[PDB]
Amino acid sequence: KKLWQKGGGWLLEVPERVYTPEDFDESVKEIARTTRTFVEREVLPLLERMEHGELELNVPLMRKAGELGLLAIDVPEEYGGLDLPKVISTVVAEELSGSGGFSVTYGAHTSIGTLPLVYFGTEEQKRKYLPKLASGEWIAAYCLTEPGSGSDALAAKTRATLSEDGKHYILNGVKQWISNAGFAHLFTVFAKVDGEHFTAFLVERDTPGLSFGPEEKKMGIKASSTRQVILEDVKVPVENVLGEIGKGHKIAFNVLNVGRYKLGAGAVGGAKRALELSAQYATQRVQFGRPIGRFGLIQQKLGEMASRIYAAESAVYRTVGLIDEALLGKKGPEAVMAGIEEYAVEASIIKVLGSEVLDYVVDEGVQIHGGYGYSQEYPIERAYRDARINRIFEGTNEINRLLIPGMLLRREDLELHQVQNLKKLALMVAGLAVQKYGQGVEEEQEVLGAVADILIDAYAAESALLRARRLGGLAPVLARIYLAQALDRAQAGALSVLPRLVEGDEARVVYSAARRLTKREPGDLVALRRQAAEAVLEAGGYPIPR
Amino acid sequence: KKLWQKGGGWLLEVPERVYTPEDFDESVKEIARTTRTFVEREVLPLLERMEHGELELNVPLMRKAGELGLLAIDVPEEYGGLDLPKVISTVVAEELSGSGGFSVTYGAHTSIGTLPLVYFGTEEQKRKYLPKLASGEWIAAYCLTEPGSGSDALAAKTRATLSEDGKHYILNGVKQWISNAGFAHLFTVFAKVDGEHFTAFLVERDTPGLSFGPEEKKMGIKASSTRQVILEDVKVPVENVLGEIGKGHKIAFNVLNVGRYKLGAGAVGGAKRALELSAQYATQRVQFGRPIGRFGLIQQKLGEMASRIYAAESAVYRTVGLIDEALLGKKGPEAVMAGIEEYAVEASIIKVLGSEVLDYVVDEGVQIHGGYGYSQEYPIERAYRDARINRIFEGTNEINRLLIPGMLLRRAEPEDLELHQVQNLKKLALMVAGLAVQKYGQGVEEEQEVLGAVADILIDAYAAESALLRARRLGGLAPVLARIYLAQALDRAQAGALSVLPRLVEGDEARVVYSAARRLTKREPGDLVALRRQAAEAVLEAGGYPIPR
Ligand SMILES: Cc1cc2nc3c(=O)[nH]c(=O)nc-3n(C[C@H](O)[C@H](O)[C@H](O)COP(=O)(O)OP(=O)(O)OC[C@H]3O[C@@H](n4cnc5c(N)ncnc54)[C@H](O)[C@@H]3O)c2cc1C
Ligand SMILES: Cc1cc2nc3c(=O)[nH]c(=O)nc-3n(C[C@H](O)[C@H](O)[C@H](O)COP(=O)(O)OP(=O)(O)OC[C@H]3O[C@@H](n4cnc5c(N)ncnc54)[C@H](O)[C@@H]3O)c2cc1C
């Protein structure tokens, strides 16, 4: 409703409330512990065997996750589901996404593999498929991407031709990088009827003509199964058509929303796990008669890691909190999808923010381990390789940076003040871009990108601050650290693209306006970062208590 | 002995000239071509097999490189070497960045493996070792690092005691991460006599008591052999003592200078390869009915990549060019080491700059390939993994960042405005460095964050300047690449200086300093979008690094 509580509304009015992890009720904390115990003695123990080929172990693990209720969170109760708030589904992603590639096995099943059926599945379809997906008896896979089509999903080339008796749809094509392909019982495949209508198709594993290429040799997440799905004259019952023929884009787009914030959450969990390894090793490794964790350059890293993680975590749950708020007393796939679509920009922001925060965390984590961070014997080595795929998933970060500004171009507390100034700078640059390129503003990708980065930092900075005022303790420091640098990036980012939007003398005032919108007093990043570092070493990881 | 020529002289005065890549005399352009041929026809064809176990293929490859004279470049003539200018061994390092792990095999051998003998090798021990190393008949290894000691190399605890006889030394200890250990014939090992005198020793592979752990499993450079070397009562002839007892630190410190600039050149080479791969893929991959290379965000990456590579490349060869001149009319280990040591600071700067530029280039290279960049079937995937080790090798970038400010701590109007901004960066560094000293004094070492921000300014200064001065001679796209780098360097300078200044000054005095830091980094907004797009177009046009061979 209110202009501030609506999607992207934070861009004009400050939120009068923000959901933080300190708001997790007892049911959320209960499941987080359940998940933590689950990965503690079920996933981690088989991780090494899985990283070495025994991908089939993903099957008995998904069954236990199912028996724990972790596979029925986002499933309607009338189909074996628990239908719980998105925060529960989110915290689960967070806690599961730090033990290994099993996070992708779980992620592909619970989101893209299951949601399409929940959002567009007919009664019969949901009755004979969902129960098994929520229990874990069956594992799902999503088949959209193809060799010559990825970011441009709607370009799939797989063909669907109606059989002579019109009782089946004959599919022919090749699916690229399909998660869970090695053992999924159900496949949601995308093909074009007569080569013209992008459509979704429920396809069972035991179907003639359906084969799979060998496991892909990847940089990371080796514990996850990824194969090419080959469809050669695969007859699919006409009743297995998911959604509307020609309207398969509707399924693809809607699931992406959940994939996004879910990934943001997982990135936070992995970043936290990586910080644990770094903090513990910074304490345990001694060089030059001193634990390296006591060296200025190591503290700088640890403090920065804690700061970015805190900012991303705040943004993620603030986003999820808004979503659940909107889903209150709201039933029906249409209503559910709409509620979520409301914060699509927020979803893209945290996904870009989270993936990138985790990139820094695992990078510096390796650095802290020195040569050892380059050994397969150290878990940090695996974290570095596994984290690289995140900037590609749920739409690459480039595609997401192009979407974030979308809903902006025709579609006293000093720190808080500066946050509001960040918002104004985004609007300013955004406006100047449109008042110069009009319709073809989407061509100026570099301009949109700069806008998106300011928006991401604005949202991130505000989430960190607002939460810091409520939490207190170290929180304010971690927020100050983030905001300081967000201001640095904003000024530089704006000055790198503004010259492209204006010139002459009319630009002179524009640049000055920017310098003013990003004005602030320099903070002692040295002192602040060390303070956070001390807290990190003292806690052996993320310094913010549960 | 001019003012600017001296090590760090570019900090007080402007250089009268800089050695650039287009200043390569035919001799250099020759060996470079030989290396390129050696890689495409010998090394590359075997890369896959070596990355899958057959590490012994390094032996025949090393023999071939030896017959080509690539292993004798930095070796004295009277020992089967060619004793050529450092520029040559540097370009060879750069061109070998396409051999994958073999680059480490070659690098460890020619630098840490051979140099110790060349620098401190006794007359007789150089005749019976150097010839084989220079020919490739014998592969050398360097054993300094230990499980408990890495950055603090001198903390090694491998012990050495003189036998009753007095003719041999008994070695006991463990050396960690030894490149070439799987097939090396000669080993330079560091130990302390009676646990107090850091000393280097020559140990032949076939020496009883010396064993090796299994091949280390790492994230990258799998084509390289890396094993743990164990010493259980190893007998070493007294004459096998390399250098002077207790002065083993000298060997370790001098080899690091060469390793750093050769690595910086290596990183530049790897970056170019990653760029070729990225440019090529950007032209072939079509999404949304158009080559991705036509989209703004991809062009931004391609432009930034070419810009950072140009800066690093300019700084690297300018550095080596200085060393070479300071080496003219000089022979002997002592003179050559002091000549190279003169630019220890520059070596560290290009070491940090190179590895960080390559890091960025392979990362965006992976991004450009989307999912396929995560696939072992695409070379960009291996390059991302192989690159990671560079920020650790030759001293971690943290250690190097602490060394750069060293010299700056040993003390207490338009017209070519671009070159002026470069001068201000130099001033910026001096301002911060000074304030740090006039506050913490002799204890300024503990303020590593402060030293790091100072080092990052010195790095961008040297790089930008070296990039700008070359653009003036080179012309063409050069100026554009130099401008792209300069603008960004100034932004990083302001942010960095201001992120460590509140630590040195406070109150009213602090505000004055803050305004000075800003003016010293004040610049006029440049259109990076336009400039990067211009570089991109050139990249896609040249299919990689736009600057002509
Ligand atoms: C593939 C490979 C090949 C190798 N080949 C060889 C070889 O041929 N010969 C050989 O001798 N060795 C070799 N090594 C090993 C290399 O020399 C060591 O790995 C390196 O010196 C180890 O440093 P470390 O890992 O022990 O530092 P840690 O990994 O012990 O260091 C972690 C830290 O360095 C910290 N640090 C250290 N000192 C300071 C300080 N004073 N101030 C601030 N921060 C500090 C960083 O900030 C960070 O916290 C090789 C290693 C690898 C991985
Ligand atoms: C481990 C793994 C698991 C996977 N699991 C699944 C799964 O379960 N189901 C599934 O369907 N798929 C899956 N995929 C594949 C994933 O969906 C595709 O890899 C992704 O969509 C591919 O994009 P691409 O690689 O084809 O882009 P390319 O790699 O084709 O894209 C390169 C480019 O995207 C560019 N780009 C594209 N459009 C634009 C634009 N408009 N503006 C600016 N830049 C643009 C970037 O800038 C860059 O140049 C998985 C992949 C991996 C690696």
mmCIF file of N, CA, C and O in Angstrom, chain A residues 437-496:
data_model
loop_
_atom_site.group_PDB
_atom_site.id
_atom_site.type_symbol
_atom_site.label_atom_id
_atom_site.label_comp_id
_atom_site.label_asym_id
_atom_site.label_seq_id
_atom_site.Cartn_x
_atom_site.Cartn_y
_atom_site.Cartn_z
ATOM 1 N N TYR A 437 18.516 9.995 -23.889
ATOM 2 C CA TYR A 437 18.433 8.823 -24.748
ATOM 3 C C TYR A 437 17.000 8.342 -24.926
ATOM 4 O O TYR A 437 16.706 7.536 -25.810
ATOM 5 N N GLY A 438 16.117 8.849 -24.073
ATOM 6 C CA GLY A 438 14.712 8.485 -24.140
ATOM 7 C C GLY A 438 14.439 7.005 -24.293
ATOM 8 O O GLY A 438 14.777 6.205 -23.424
ATOM 9 N N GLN A 439 13.826 6.641 -25.410
ATOM 10 C CA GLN A 439 13.480 5.251 -25.683
ATOM 11 C C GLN A 439 14.666 4.292 -25.674
ATOM 12 O O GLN A 439 14.603 3.220 -25.070
ATOM 13 N N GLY A 440 15.742 4.674 -26.350
ATOM 14 C CA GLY A 440 16.907 3.818 -26.417
ATOM 15 C C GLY A 440 17.856 3.946 -25.245
ATOM 16 O O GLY A 440 19.068 3.896 -25.426
ATOM 17 N N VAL A 441 17.314 4.111 -24.043
ATOM 18 C CA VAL A 441 18.140 4.241 -22.853
ATOM 19 C C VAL A 441 18.714 2.880 -22.434
ATOM 20 O O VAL A 441 19.760 2.815 -21.803
ATOM 21 N N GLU A 442 18.036 1.795 -22.798
ATOM 22 C CA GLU A 442 18.525 0.466 -22.430
ATOM 23 C C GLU A 442 19.805 0.086 -23.168
ATOM 24 O O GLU A 442 20.459 -0.897 -22.822
ATOM 25 N N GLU A 443 20.155 0.863 -24.188
ATOM 26 C CA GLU A 443 21.370 0.609 -24.952
ATOM 27 C C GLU A 443 22.574 1.072 -24.145
ATOM 28 O O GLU A 443 23.664 0.525 -24.275
ATOM 29 N N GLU A 444 22.373 2.084 -23.310
ATOM 30 C CA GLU A 444 23.457 2.603 -22.488
ATOM 31 C C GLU A 444 23.665 1.726 -21.250
ATOM 32 O O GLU A 444 23.529 2.174 -20.112
ATOM 33 N N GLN A 445 24.020 0.472 -21.499
ATOM 34 C CA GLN A 445 24.235 -0.498 -20.433
ATOM 35 C C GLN A 445 25.225 -0.051 -19.367
ATOM 36 O O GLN A 445 25.000 -0.286 -18.184
ATOM 37 N N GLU A 446 26.319 0.583 -19.775
ATOM 38 C CA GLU A 446 27.297 1.039 -18.797
ATOM 39 C C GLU A 446 26.646 2.063 -17.873
ATOM 40 O O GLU A 446 26.910 2.066 -16.665
ATOM 41 N N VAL A 447 25.787 2.919 -18.433
ATOM 42 C CA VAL A 447 25.100 3.941 -17.632
ATOM 43 C C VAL A 447 24.147 3.293 -16.636
ATOM 44 O O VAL A 447 24.096 3.674 -15.461
ATOM 45 N N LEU A 448 23.384 2.316 -17.115
ATOM 46 C CA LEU A 448 22.430 1.594 -16.284
ATOM 47 C C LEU A 448 23.169 0.864 -15.177
ATOM 48 O O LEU A 448 22.710 0.824 -14.032
ATOM 49 N N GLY A 449 24.320 0.295 -15.525
ATOM 50 C CA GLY A 449 25.118 -0.424 -14.553
ATOM 51 C C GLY A 449 25.524 0.466 -13.388
ATOM 52 O O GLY A 449 25.357 0.085 -12.226
ATOM 53 N N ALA A 450 26.060 1.648 -13.703
ATOM 54 C CA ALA A 450 26.476 2.596 -12.671
ATOM 55 C C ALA A 450 25.279 2.931 -11.785
ATOM 56 O O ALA A 450 25.402 3.035 -10.565
ATOM 57 N N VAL A 451 24.117 3.092 -12.404
ATOM 58 C CA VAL A 451 22.903 3.411 -11.672
ATOM 59 C C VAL A 451 22.603 2.243 -10.750
ATOM 60 O O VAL A 451 22.386 2.421 -9.550
ATOM 61 N N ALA A 452 22.618 1.036 -11.297
ATOM 62 C CA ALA A 452 22.345 -0.137 -10.491
ATOM 63 C C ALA A 452 23.272 -0.272 -9.289
ATOM 64 O O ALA A 452 22.813 -0.646 -8.212
ATOM 65 N N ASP A 453 24.561 0.042 -9.464
ATOM 66 C CA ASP A 453 25.521 -0.093 -8.363
ATOM 67 C C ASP A 453 25.230 0.863 -7.219
ATOM 68 O O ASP A 453 25.405 0.518 -6.054
ATOM 69 N N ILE A 454 24.796 2.069 -7.561
ATOM 70 C CA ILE A 454 24.444 3.056 -6.552
ATOM 71 C C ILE A 454 23.187 2.556 -5.847
ATOM 72 O O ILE A 454 23.078 2.632 -4.623
ATOM 73 N N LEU A 455 22.237 2.015 -6.602
ATOM 74 C CA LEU A 455 21.004 1.512 -6.001
ATOM 75 C C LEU A 455 21.280 0.361 -5.036
ATOM 76 O O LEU A 455 20.714 0.311 -3.934
ATOM 77 N N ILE A 456 22.157 -0.552 -5.449
ATOM 78 C CA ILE A 456 22.527 -1.697 -4.631
ATOM 79 C C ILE A 456 23.162 -1.195 -3.335
ATOM 80 O O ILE A 456 22.768 -1.617 -2.252
ATOM 81 N N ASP A 457 24.135 -0.289 -3.444
ATOM 82 C CA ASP A 457 24.768 0.239 -2.241
ATOM 83 C C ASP A 457 23.774 1.019 -1.378
ATOM 84 O O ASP A 457 23.825 0.930 -0.154
ATOM 85 N N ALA A 458 22.873 1.771 -2.012
ATOM 86 C CA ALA A 458 21.883 2.542 -1.257
ATOM 87 C C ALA A 458 21.058 1.585 -0.417
ATOM 88 O O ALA A 458 20.971 1.717 0.806
ATOM 89 N N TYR A 459 20.457 0.607 -1.085
ATOM 90 C CA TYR A 459 19.619 -0.360 -0.405
ATOM 91 C C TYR A 459 20.405 -1.099 0.672
ATOM 92 O O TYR A 459 19.933 -1.263 1.797
ATOM 93 N N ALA A 460 21.607 -1.539 0.317
ATOM 94 C CA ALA A 460 22.466 -2.262 1.231
ATOM 95 C C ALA A 460 22.838 -1.387 2.425
ATOM 96 O O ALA A 460 22.722 -1.816 3.566
ATOM 97 N N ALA A 461 23.280 -0.162 2.153
ATOM 98 C CA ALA A 461 23.674 0.749 3.223
ATOM 99 C C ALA A 461 22.513 1.035 4.167
ATOM 100 O O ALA A 461 22.672 0.974 5.385
ATOM 101 N N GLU A 462 21.339 1.323 3.615
ATOM 102 C CA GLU A 462 20.179 1.607 4.444
ATOM 103 C C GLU A 462 19.761 0.406 5.294
ATOM 104 O O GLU A 462 19.380 0.574 6.454
ATOM 105 N N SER A 463 19.821 -0.797 4.727
ATOM 106 C CA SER A 463 19.450 -1.994 5.472
ATOM 107 C C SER A 463 20.400 -2.153 6.656
ATOM 108 O O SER A 463 19.969 -2.413 7.776
ATOM 109 N N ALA A 464 21.693 -1.979 6.396
ATOM 110 C CA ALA A 464 22.706 -2.104 7.441
ATOM 111 C C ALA A 464 22.501 -1.056 8.532
ATOM 112 O O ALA A 464 22.520 -1.370 9.717
ATOM 113 N N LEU A 465 22.308 0.193 8.126
ATOM 114 C CA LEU A 465 22.123 1.252 9.117
ATOM 115 C C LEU A 465 20.892 1.069 9.981
ATOM 116 O O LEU A 465 20.998 0.967 11.204
ATOM 117 N N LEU A 466 19.724 1.030 9.342
ATOM 118 C CA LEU A 466 18.465 0.879 10.052
ATOM 119 C C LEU A 466 18.544 -0.280 11.018
ATOM 120 O O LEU A 466 18.124 -0.166 12.167
ATOM 121 N N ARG A 467 19.092 -1.403 10.571
ATOM 122 C CA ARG A 467 19.211 -2.544 11.455
ATOM 123 C C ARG A 467 20.209 -2.256 12.582
ATOM 124 O O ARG A 467 20.010 -2.693 13.714
ATOM 125 N N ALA A 468 21.270 -1.510 12.278
ATOM 126 C CA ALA A 468 22.293 -1.186 13.278
ATOM 127 C C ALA A 468 21.739 -0.355 14.435
ATOM 128 O O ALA A 468 22.179 -0.486 15.579
ATOM 129 N N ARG A 469 20.776 0.505 14.130
ATOM 130 C CA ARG A 469 20.160 1.334 15.154
ATOM 131 C C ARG A 469 19.360 0.470 16.121
ATOM 132 O O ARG A 469 19.265 0.776 17.304
ATOM 133 N N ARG A 470 18.793 -0.618 15.616
ATOM 134 C CA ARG A 470 18.005 -1.506 16.463
ATOM 135 C C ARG A 470 18.873 -2.515 17.202
ATOM 136 O O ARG A 470 18.633 -2.833 18.370
ATOM 137 N N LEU A 471 19.894 -3.013 16.517
ATOM 138 C CA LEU A 471 20.769 -4.019 17.088
ATOM 139 C C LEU A 471 21.826 -3.449 18.037
ATOM 140 O O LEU A 471 22.042 -3.983 19.124
ATOM 141 N N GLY A 472 22.482 -2.367 17.643
ATOM 142 C CA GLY A 472 23.507 -1.802 18.498
ATOM 143 C C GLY A 472 24.747 -2.677 18.504
ATOM 144 O O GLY A 472 24.922 -3.541 17.633
ATOM 145 N N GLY A 473 25.614 -2.466 19.484
ATOM 146 C CA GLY A 473 26.831 -3.250 19.582
ATOM 147 C C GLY A 473 27.813 -2.995 18.449
ATOM 148 O O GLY A 473 28.143 -1.844 18.150
ATOM 149 N N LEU A 474 28.272 -4.065 17.803
ATOM 150 C CA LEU A 474 29.227 -3.923 16.710
ATOM 151 C C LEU A 474 28.556 -3.522 15.403
ATOM 152 O O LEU A 474 29.183 -2.929 14.520
ATOM 153 N N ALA A 475 27.272 -3.847 15.293
ATOM 154 C CA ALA A 475 26.517 -3.535 14.090
ATOM 155 C C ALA A 475 26.803 -2.133 13.526
ATOM 156 O O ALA A 475 27.191 -2.003 12.362
ATOM 157 N N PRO A 476 26.638 -1.071 14.332
ATOM 158 C CA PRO A 476 26.908 0.276 13.805
ATOM 159 C C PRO A 476 28.272 0.419 13.111
ATOM 160 O O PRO A 476 28.385 1.062 12.071
ATOM 161 N N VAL A 477 29.306 -0.175 13.697
ATOM 162 C CA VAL A 477 30.644 -0.125 13.122
ATOM 163 C C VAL A 477 30.651 -0.787 11.731
ATOM 164 O O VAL A 477 31.129 -0.198 10.753
ATOM 165 N N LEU A 478 30.102 -2.000 11.641
ATOM 166 C CA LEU A 478 30.054 -2.721 10.366
ATOM 167 C C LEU A 478 29.286 -1.931 9.304
ATOM 168 O O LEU A 478 29.608 -1.987 8.122
ATOM 169 N N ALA A 479 28.276 -1.186 9.729
ATOM 170 C CA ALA A 479 27.502 -0.392 8.794
ATOM 171 C C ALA A 479 28.312 0.830 8.348
ATOM 172 O O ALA A 479 28.332 1.164 7.170
ATOM 173 N N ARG A 480 28.996 1.474 9.289
ATOM 174 C CA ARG A 480 29.798 2.664 8.990
ATOM 175 C C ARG A 480 30.898 2.323 7.983
ATOM 176 O O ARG A 480 31.240 3.110 7.096
ATOM 177 N N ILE A 481 31.449 1.134 8.132
ATOM 178 C CA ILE A 481 32.494 0.688 7.255
ATOM 179 C C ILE A 481 31.937 0.562 5.837
ATOM 180 O O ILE A 481 32.564 1.007 4.872
ATOM 181 N N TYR A 482 30.753 -0.031 5.716
ATOM 182 C CA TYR A 482 30.144 -0.243 4.412
ATOM 183 C C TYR A 482 29.738 1.063 3.747
ATOM 184 O O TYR A 482 30.073 1.323 2.591
ATOM 185 N N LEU A 483 29.012 1.885 4.495
ATOM 186 C CA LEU A 483 28.559 3.174 3.997
ATOM 187 C C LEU A 483 29.724 4.026 3.516
ATOM 188 O O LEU A 483 29.649 4.627 2.447
ATOM 189 N N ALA A 484 30.814 4.064 4.277
ATOM 190 C CA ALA A 484 31.957 4.888 3.873
ATOM 191 C C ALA A 484 32.411 4.573 2.463
ATOM 192 O O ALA A 484 32.612 5.476 1.649
ATOM 193 N N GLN A 485 32.571 3.287 2.181
ATOM 194 C CA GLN A 485 33.024 2.855 0.873
ATOM 195 C C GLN A 485 31.937 2.960 -0.184
ATOM 196 O O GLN A 485 32.236 3.180 -1.354
ATOM 197 N N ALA A 486 30.680 2.806 0.226
ATOM 198 C CA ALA A 486 29.571 2.926 -0.713
ATOM 199 C C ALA A 486 29.584 4.367 -1.234
ATOM 200 O O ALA A 486 29.324 4.606 -2.412
ATOM 201 N N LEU A 487 29.914 5.321 -0.365
ATOM 202 C CA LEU A 487 29.968 6.723 -0.788
ATOM 203 C C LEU A 487 31.087 6.942 -1.802
ATOM 204 O O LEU A 487 30.917 7.678 -2.783
ATOM 205 N N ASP A 488 32.228 6.296 -1.567
ATOM 206 C CA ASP A 488 33.380 6.384 -2.465
ATOM 207 C C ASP A 488 32.999 5.866 -3.854
ATOM 208 O O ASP A 488 33.293 6.488 -4.867
ATOM 209 N N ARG A 489 32.346 4.713 -3.891
ATOM 210 C CA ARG A 489 31.952 4.111 -5.157
ATOM 211 C C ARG A 489 30.924 4.958 -5.892
ATOM 212 O O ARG A 489 31.007 5.134 -7.105
ATOM 213 N N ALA A 490 29.962 5.489 -5.148
ATOM 214 C CA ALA A 490 28.927 6.327 -5.738
ATOM 215 C C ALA A 490 29.522 7.522 -6.491
ATOM 216 O O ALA A 490 29.231 7.717 -7.666
ATOM 217 N N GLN A 491 30.354 8.317 -5.825
ATOM 218 C CA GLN A 491 30.961 9.480 -6.466
ATOM 219 C C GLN A 491 31.732 9.070 -7.724
ATOM 220 O O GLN A 491 31.542 9.653 -8.791
ATOM 221 N N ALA A 492 32.591 8.060 -7.596
ATOM 222 C CA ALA A 492 33.382 7.585 -8.727
ATOM 223 C C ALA A 492 32.505 7.028 -9.843
ATOM 224 O O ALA A 492 32.736 7.307 -11.026
ATOM 225 N N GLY A 493 31.506 6.238 -9.471
ATOM 226 C CA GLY A 493 30.633 5.662 -10.475
ATOM 227 C C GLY A 493 29.839 6.719 -11.226
ATOM 228 O O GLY A 493 29.633 6.612 -12.432
ATOM 229 N N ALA A 494 29.384 7.738 -10.509
ATOM 230 C CA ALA A 494 28.603 8.799 -11.131
ATOM 231 C C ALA A 494 29.484 9.647 -12.036
ATOM 232 O O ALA A 494 29.092 10.005 -13.141
ATOM 233 N N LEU A 495 30.686 9.952 -11.571
ATOM 234 C CA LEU A 495 31.591 10.753 -12.374
ATOM 235 C C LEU A 495 32.159 9.980 -13.565
ATOM 236 O O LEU A 495 32.750 10.578 -14.460
ATOM 237 N N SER A 496 31.976 8.662 -13.595
ATOM 238 C CA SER A 496 32.499 7.901 -14.728
ATOM 239 C C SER A 496 31.462 7.789 -15.838
ATOM 240 O O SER A 496 31.794 7.444 -16.972
#
